[PDB]
Design a protein around this nucleic acid. Sequence first.
DNA 1: TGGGACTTTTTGA
DNA 2: TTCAAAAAGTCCCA
Length: 543
Amino acid sequence: YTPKIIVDYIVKKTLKNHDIIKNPYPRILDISCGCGNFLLEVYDILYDLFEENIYELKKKYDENYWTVDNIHRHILNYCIYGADIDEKAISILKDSLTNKKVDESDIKINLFCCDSLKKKWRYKFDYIVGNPPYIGHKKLEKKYKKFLLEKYSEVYKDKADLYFCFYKKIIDILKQGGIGSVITPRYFLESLSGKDLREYIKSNVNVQEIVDFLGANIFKNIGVSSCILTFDKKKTKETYIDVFKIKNEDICINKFETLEELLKSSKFEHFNINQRLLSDEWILVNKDDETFYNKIQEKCKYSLEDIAISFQGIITGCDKAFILSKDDVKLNLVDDKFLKCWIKSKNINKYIVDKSEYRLIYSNDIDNENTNKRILDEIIGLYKTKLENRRECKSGIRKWYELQWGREKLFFERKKIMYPYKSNENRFAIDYDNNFSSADVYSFFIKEEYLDKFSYEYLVGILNSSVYDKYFKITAKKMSKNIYDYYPNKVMKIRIFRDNNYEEIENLSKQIISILLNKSIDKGKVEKLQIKMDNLIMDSLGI
DNA sequence: TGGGACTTTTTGA
DNA sequence: TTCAAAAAGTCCCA
Ligand SMILES: Cc1cc(Nc2cc(CN3CCN(C)CC3)cc(NC(=O)c3cccc(Nc4ccnc5ccccc45)c3)c2)nc(N)n1
């Protein structure tokens, strides 16, 4: 059930400036009405609009048709259209619409109980409103997904969400100069699946307003990040997008009776984006952040991808059969050549890695099963059946006791920089202990030809700085509230500089490392050091 | 007695 | 062959 305030805002956004005198026959469609939250409000708005200009319509058009008593019949005959797949909800909505007036004379309501994505729509619509469903993967049928791939190939790929196709439908059946307004999951704004959908939206319609609630709990007891999209097919030359980006994600939607008061408040920020200048990922930042990002990009002559080699952690396929507590007795059964240090995301802090509390049995170095039979029978064999259900074990590529994705031994066993893949801040650490990690920690190492130009200490010094934290978070992908995705595709794009401040930055980073490593804690001074380093970085970037 | 955050491994390429 | 992205269900406490 969509919140009433958002429904009212969407309906008013679509219908407020409709010239009922010029076009007293508007077609407003809900594609996922369900109980009919949007359609009842549309009915109320239309009834008020018709009654306000009833005598003007009576004078302009047929005098006998336009009467106050006939408004209900006219709205139900020519104006309101709803579609859904639940017949009980359709009947409830039809009863609610009939009870709005209180057959007597051929009362007909244009409500359809059908698959909206498969219906052959006989005519397009002036206005479209609503909230497409959020049910995918588990709910879809094998035959249904194949039909989606064939029919909606321009927005639907692999395991993409269903509502993508709904966008494809809403644009297609929107009359020229019409208005559409929906509330959907926000994930398509920056996910790789939505690239085709975003291109389709950009090239087919004009986006007017984007309200981005980020991780705010819009829907009660549902963990979906929602956003409101308003678009039109009007012949416009400028096509600038208003963006209302939320600031406080911990708000509840009761601050005012109207969403406009919330948007106009300090809990939201507003900025304009030129649609023609949109990239393929829809960064959607304001002017100050854009200037900051542009200056940093211009100042830096190198990037992480240019000078570093990145990789993903070990994927064992069954962690319980290979990861043990470093104090476990069964580790006496394993030769120390097979044991490697193992860390988690929580082990990663700024500039350093916590001491490994776990050991990984690098079983790929076990050649035959007869020599190390004790390890296989008494440690790894406890999950052997599960290990045999892995894809590569079935295909015959991987032995049952081997790691499914053991990567390269030498990549991990070197000096390198590690970072968690999901964090609330930049946490890049130098690994001095040849630590191994799961896929929750990514790693990279400096290329040989860039070793003299760049050092690990300097890299972690600038990367953990507040400047680079803001710089990354500007374009970073947000998947949860206060949690960003630190993945190689976005991390390795980070640009880095090298100037006369290099030596002092590296020295401050080394001081921070030395303070962090020493057992007796005096960590407060690190903050002070950090501050100084940030200053230098700003002096380098002119910010 | 109800309500949200969390890391392992499955899978396309 | 192996990369890396993203899908995905179990749990507890005041
Ligand atoms: C926040 C919360 C959790 C909770 N239990 C709970 C907690 C935890 C984690 N803890 C442990 C203590 N800390 C060190 C960290 C937090 C784990 C579990 N079980 C688990 O079975 C568990 C443990 C680790 C990872 C995962 N797979 C997923 C992780 C993340 N995304 C996913 C999305 C879809 C599907 C699966 C996951 C499941 C259950 N109970 C209450 N009250 N609150």
